Design a protein around this nucleic acid. Structure first.
Length: 225
DNA sequence: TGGGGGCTT
DNA sequence: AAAGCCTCCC
């Protein structure tokens, strides 16, 4: 409906590439249709539409992102995320519910990981009191993408990592049978190990986790122990 | 296991 | 912009 979205849809479509669509789609296990438009082209095409229509008012950004999210081809969600980054300064704690919706719709690692450690990680840093309003809820939801969100929001924290909170969240999900949860646990631990390898090594040796998670967690540090 | 064209700095 | 890195994938 929104002219900006429809313009973007027609522009993207005119520049699709079936030869690139196949491998891109297979990378995501065929959960999505792809136009076959990679990042440099996708951003240029977005740029073109912005040059013509200009970037919409901040009070419209959510409608545009939702309309893009509803379109079949994956690049439209990738473009929606490019757009959200442009409005980054206007995204705050009142947008958590909107972000939850994006996380649980058209869900896969590519969209969820693009939302969580950046947007949500920044938000909880700025609004510490909201962690208890969201994280326990996400863990208990049995929606694996919200559960992944609770694990990964601190991914980029480095020295800001709240270790007790991290290990609490992991402990809550350590028995999950979900592939993308075991992976998220391994990832956050592997990433945090670049800052504090000793504590991650100890945690992995001394606590219950899926073998998958243990392997992912220590893949870069095992050479040191 | 553990390293990879597409992506990033 | 030369070169390191990889969520994921296999």
């Amino acid at each position: 409906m929104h002219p900006f979205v429809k313009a973007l849809q027609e522009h993207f479509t005119a520049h699709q590439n079936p030869e690139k669509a196949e491998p891109m789609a297979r990378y995501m296990k065929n959960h999505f249709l792809f136009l076959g438009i990679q990042t440099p082209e996708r951003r240029q095409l977005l740029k073109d539409i912005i040059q013509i229509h200009t970037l919409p008012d901040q009070k419209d950004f959510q409608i545009i992102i939702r309309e893009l999210w509803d379109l079949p081809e994956r690049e439209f969600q990738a473009a929606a995320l490019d757009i959200m980054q442009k409005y980054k300064k206007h995204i705050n704690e009142t947008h958590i519910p909107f972000l939850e919706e994006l996380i649980v719709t058209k869900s896969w690692w590519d969209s969820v990981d693009s939302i969580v450690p950046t947007f949500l990680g920044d938000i909880f840093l700025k609004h510490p009191e909201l962690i208890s309003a969201y994280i326990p809820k996400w863990i208990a939801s049995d929606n694996i993408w919200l559960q992944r969100a609770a694990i990964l929001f601190q991914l980029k924290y480095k020295q800001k990592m709240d270790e007790e909170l991290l290990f609490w969240i992991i402990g809550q999900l350590h028995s999950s049978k979900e592939f993308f949860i075991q992976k998220a646990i391994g990832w956050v631990l592997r990433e945090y190990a670049k800052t504090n390898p000793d504590v991650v090594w100890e945690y992995v040796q001394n606590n219950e986790l899926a073998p998958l998670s243990k392997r992912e967690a220590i893949k870069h540090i095992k050479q040191n122990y």
